Design an enzyme around this catalytic site. Structure first.
Site: not given
Ligand code: 12U
Ligand code: CA
Length: 223
Positions: A40, A84, A175, A177-178
């Protein structure tokens, strides 16, 4: 990173920043020419920044290298975030040193309870936004299968694990992410997703890198 701490300059020498005129994701150096990140995080015009601490100041030890290839898992699904993972090839090899180093791929999957280091330049707040200049760190355990699926029913695939704290206050965030989840010297996770950040009962969800070691090796060898 929410509820973490200032790592210390170049204490996480495999941590990279993906840059497109701003920091937008993390990644992990696994050899002098290849970076592991999240699918992503894909976009064109990716610059890989190695050897970073303060992402807003040139302090020394930085190497900026454009990506020459960004390879998203062919089975990545953007709605479920299954698979991912993305491989990024550097236009030129990085110069490896004590401040720019590769991290090992795991030999086996880690187990629940295993304590890991999670790092990033992502949001440091549970609500609202604050982004740091310097690299932040978080120590977090891998959670059990059951708790992870209890927390996110029907959303956890065999390619995801949960790590963190059910009590709230400490997590990765946007931020980050990855970026790396490193356990015992091995890259076991990639920062993927979660509900909000550092909310109670909603731990971080991470790409299970041990399932992709063969893929990663086969892909790199072929490119
Ligand atoms: N540790 C944390 N709370 C954390 C949360 C969010 C992120 C960044 N990643 C994201 O924001 C991702 C990328 C696109 C939407 N994102 C999501 O977090 C959405 N997740 C979905 C919907 C729920 C059911 C299956 C999973 C797919 C990174 C870390
Ligand atoms: Ca810098």
């Amino acid at each position: 990173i929410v509820g973490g701490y200032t790592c210390g300059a170049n204490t996480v020498p495999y941590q990279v920043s993906l840059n497109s005129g701003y920091h937008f994701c993390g990644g992990s150096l696994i050899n002098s020419q290849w970076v592991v990140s999240a699918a992503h995080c894909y976009k064109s015009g990716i610059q890989v920044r190695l050897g970073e601490d303060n992402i807003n100041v040139v302090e020394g030890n930085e190497q900026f290298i454009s990506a020459s290839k960004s390879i998203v898992h062919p089975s990545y699904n953007s709605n479920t975030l299954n698979n991912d993972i993305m491989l990024i090839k550097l236009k030129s090899a990085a110069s490896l040193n004590s401040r720019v180093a590769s991290i090992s791929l795991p030999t086996s999957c880690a187990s629940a309870g295993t304590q890991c280091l999670i790092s990033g330049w992502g949001n440091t707040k549970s609500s609202g936004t604050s982004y740091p200049d310097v690299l932040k760190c978080l120590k977090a355990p891998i959670l059990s299968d059951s708790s992870c699926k209890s927390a996110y029913p029907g959303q956890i695939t065999s390619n995801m694990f949960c790590a963190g704290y059910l009590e709230g206050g400490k997590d990765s965030c946007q931020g980050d992410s990855g970026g790396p989840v490193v356990c015992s010297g091995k890259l076991q996770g990639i920062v993927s997703w979660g509900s909000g950040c550092a909310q109670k009962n909603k731990p971080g969800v991470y790409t299970k890198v041990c399932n992709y070691v063969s893929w990663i090796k086969q892909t790199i060898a072929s490119n």
